[PDB]
Amino acid sequence: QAIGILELSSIAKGMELGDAMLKAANVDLLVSKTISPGKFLLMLGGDLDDIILAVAVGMERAGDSLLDSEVIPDIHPSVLPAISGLNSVDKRQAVGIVETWSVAACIKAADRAVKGSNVTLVRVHMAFGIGGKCYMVVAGDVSDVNNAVTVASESAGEKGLLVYRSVIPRPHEAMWRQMVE
């Protein structure tokens, strides 16, 4: 129900913390990838008290390798499978895209979109790191999607970190094959 983020400046140090955080709290490994160049991104999920403990363990054990840390509390549980992978969408429906500037604001946008509408949060992508360009993809009825993008645009522009918002009813076969897949 909460997400903790750790950005390390050493790949070996990141794999060390991933073993230390998983063996100190009941947390789940959402993502664990190497952000170019020479950086490591570690995101966990689960209960807030288990996340604050996991972040605290890795925060001191990081030494000088820590670059940034952030804990996102109280998110809907359906946002977790959207970060670690894809949520399979059977129906075509409509698609909305919300591109933000920080992965913290992207998850907070994906939370208020899920908690406020009956859309299917497809995926939450992040090319760079915690401060790189991110975008969330939702699928559902044109009314559900247009409201999910409206609320997700507020939680991004409120911080001032909204890049662009888009709603695409009836996506072309070449585009729905790429946003959802």
Next chain:
Amino acid sequence: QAIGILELSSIAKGMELGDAMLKAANVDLLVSKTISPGKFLLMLGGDLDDIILAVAVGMERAGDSLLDSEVIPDIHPSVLPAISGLNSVDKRQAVGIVETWSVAACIKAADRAVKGSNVTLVRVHMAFGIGGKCYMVVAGDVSDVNNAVTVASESAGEKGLLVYRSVIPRPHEAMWRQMVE
């Protein structure tokens, strides 16, 4: 047959134009990949009138997100399957590589190589796309490849000398796979 290239500075805007351009004319979508630091690459192919109209719709509908737009006219239809595909269905004995400094020159140099002889273009790879040092792989015999490699170097060298050229008469099964990979 022509090629239309579009570069956007945001992923959400790029996938919105990729749908708006496919609904503006009868065009085929070639490449729609993401390039760091968060830019997008839209390449289309088809009739020259449908491509310019697609670029036209993609140009106005881009706003400040547009970074580069270019239309490459009068291109042999055999060049389109090399992009977002492979011509490995034909024979073997792949010979010749040409590495330009931009993709616009790599497509122009690939078209002049088809008009030179019967040498078959296996693929036209890329990296940073418009600015990347995209290369072209040829399959043919030594007598026809050297002329095809030369005209591609003169095509690139007409504006900026290509990175390097090659011959490679006999493809040791190691290097052959990588060229057609």
Next chain:
Amino acid sequence: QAIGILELSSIAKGMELGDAMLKAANVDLLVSKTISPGKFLLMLGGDLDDIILAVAVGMERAGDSLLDSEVIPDIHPSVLPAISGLNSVDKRQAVGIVETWSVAACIKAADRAVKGSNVTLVRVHMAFGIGGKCYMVVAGDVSDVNNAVTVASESAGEKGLLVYRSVIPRPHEAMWRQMVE
């Protein structure tokens, strides 16, 4: 039928080459003036093979005094008397002026104007050196002049070295007394 140009950085060295080039090929001295400050301009005319030989002789004998060289091949023979001096125009008629940026593009413009129209190429002037502002003057019927300026504007703007184009039907007595004279 061809023009060779030599720009020297020493007046004494230029007078040395003028004797060496005139005594090594059947070339004619079109102009030989001192371009300010401390520079010398040497232009020859005649057959192409005699010009390439004359330029080659002065090119090696120039030593370090050479600043730039250029051979303009295949020009109409009537452009030669227009560079060394004036072509006497009896009729008033109309006057056209084509101002270019390089003396190479000015002669190439004066060539396509003569070869394409029945105008009388008055003079080809050059205040500075081979890269300084130049302008050609033509006189004839308003139809001949308007076409001669049109073609001369192409051969200048094609390189991108066109300054300004002008056609003056019925020039005032004070102006025809200055362009032609």
Next chain:
Amino acid sequence: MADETIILNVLGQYTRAHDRRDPDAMAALFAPDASIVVLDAVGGASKPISVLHGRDAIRVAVRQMMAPHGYRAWSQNVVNAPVIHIHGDTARLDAQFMVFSILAAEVPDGGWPTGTFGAQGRIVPIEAGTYTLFLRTVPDGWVIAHMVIKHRLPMAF
């Protein structure tokens, strides 16, 4: 001079060429391989009208597709609300345009009546829409590499 000033001067000189009906002056503003894509846009549409490619197609599309000014008539292509974004060696210019018809009333032989005092003629708007320009850098300054014209009135021919 400033980059934004040079780009806006390209748009201003396009208006002077559009009103003077000068095909040589207008084609000089475009790259040799530029493309004008006139699009109809009444009702948020993008139906094509006329697509030109190259300077040669642009020059001929000024002698035709554009009524030659006759008698004592002129035009004023009012370019309004310019928005311009520059991205290094490329830039995009967006503006709104309205074309006004200018007709000069004939001056009486004996002279104007003593009662009249203002400008004597007729001015009426004809066309309206938006220009969108894509410019690339050139040793001189900027040139138009691509342009689309959205007409918000139904164009007939």
Next chain:
Amino acid sequence: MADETIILNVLGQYTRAHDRRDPDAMAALFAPDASIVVLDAVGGASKPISVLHGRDAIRVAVRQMMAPHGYRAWSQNVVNAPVIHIHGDTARLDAQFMVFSILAAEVPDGGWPTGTFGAQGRIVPIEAGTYTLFLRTVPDGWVIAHMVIKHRLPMAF
């Protein structure tokens, strides 16, 4: 990009939002606590018309107070003669505006008559006045912190 260019782009994008009737796009140009003070000014006056406070009051004042574009009609808020003074982290922009009504004539089913050749429609000015903007600096660029609109035609509701 230049400061004056960014500020003029705010005014240009306000025109695009005013003609498209896009309340989301227009409210994004203002600060969260901006104030629009529409004032009547026929005869050098300053009688109040409508005062809006905040983005929320601005969004709703686009759905209302502004006739929804219907059928084949559009507008062009011609912004003319901009004057801009910058004082560090703040700036003031002053411009003149005219709103033009655009009505598209119905295209006949069988097609346009062979005799017609120009754009077929009606363009007529409706409103006129002056915009005065007070902008403050923002990490992105500039936003509108205050705006007054002086209408030189009697506004009715």
Next chain:
Amino acid sequence: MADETIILNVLGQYTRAHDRRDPDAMAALFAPDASIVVLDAVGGASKPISVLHGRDAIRVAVRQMMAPHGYRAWSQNVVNAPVIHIHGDTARLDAQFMVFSILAAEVPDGGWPTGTFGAQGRIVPIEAGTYTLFLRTVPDGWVIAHMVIKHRLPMAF
């Protein structure tokens, strides 16, 4: 501030002075020895109309030669398509102008009818042409050292 911005502000403030009929404000924009040369230009001509020399001749040419605004009427000198070239301590500004007549309809004593909803008045173009300004540098900013006005409608007096 930028040079091109200051020069365009001179043209914008000339419009505000032209519509307000403020001779003190307009003459302050010119050099003490400036010269306005109003030229007729219907048909690519250059027939002279009125030539003013100095600030004093400019001030009096605002009280006269310019109809005093009466009742509930105003004007908007729409300056369009500015082209500006700067050559060190001097610059040349070229623009197109259209003058619009604004007439305010009388408000009924009991109030506007319940059916009316838009702006109630009349707006009509009167004059059109081109302004060409030659500006020199001044410790404050820029001033107008010379100006020619080409009217494309026959001017009567």
Next chain:
Amino acid sequence: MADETIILNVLGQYTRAHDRRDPDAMAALFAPDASIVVLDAVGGASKPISVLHGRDAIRVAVRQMMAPHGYRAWSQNVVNAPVIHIHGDTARLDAQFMVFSILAAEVPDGGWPTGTFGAQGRIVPIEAGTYTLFLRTVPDGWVIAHMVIKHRLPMAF
């Protein structure tokens, strides 16, 4: 890198291709309008031998004017004593060249006779003279725009 080093590398690539008998790499060093003037220099004279003009004449010259090596044959174009003078975007290169023929002896049966040391073959000088190059800057270094080859020995055709 150093401009003097790039020009010397152009001369080195000329000699490396002069022995390889490569016409493609040869003409790649010249401008599309480059002209080569080979002339006899026995006794300080300057009678013309060959006047090549353009890359086409240069490529064909490599096909005809020089013969490809036989089996176990090679050559070395020893260039020495260079004098460089750079004037902005242009430069001139003057150097002394001398061509040596190289022939290799076949290995008899299995190997050389027992007690054989050193190389086995012939190295004989054949040609000698002076090169003179005129180079122009390109976006990727320098190219040859004019070359004068003087031979101190008579050439047989």
Next chain:
Amino acid sequence: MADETIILNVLGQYTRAHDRRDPDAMAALFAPDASIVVLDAVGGASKPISVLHGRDAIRVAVRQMMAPHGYRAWSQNVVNAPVIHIHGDTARLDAQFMVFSILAAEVPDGGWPTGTFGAQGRIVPIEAGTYTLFLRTVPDGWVIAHMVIKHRLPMAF
């Protein structure tokens, strides 16, 4: 221009004056107080051959120590393998030299025998050794202040 290239140009102009037998151009490369020490070092040591001191002594040396070529005769002083150490305004260049003799064969009757290719003459090396120069800094350029010539072969003039 780089100093190393200027130093190499002095050496390049030395070999050209040496082959051309130019006494005025030879001593022009030397300071009026320079001293040239020619010595023999077949196996080693420094057997003094000649110690010419003075700019005029260098001019006389060309007219005496080296004989003019003659009809269809020439030479090429191939200098190579240069090492340069600047270390202040007084640099030191050291290079190996090898003098070649060039004789040209007369064209028989009305041309060479049918099928003859290449150059026709004799090219044989005659001298070899090492040059050692010490150059100071003349106001514009560099000049030679001392030179040591070690011959690997005994001179018998």
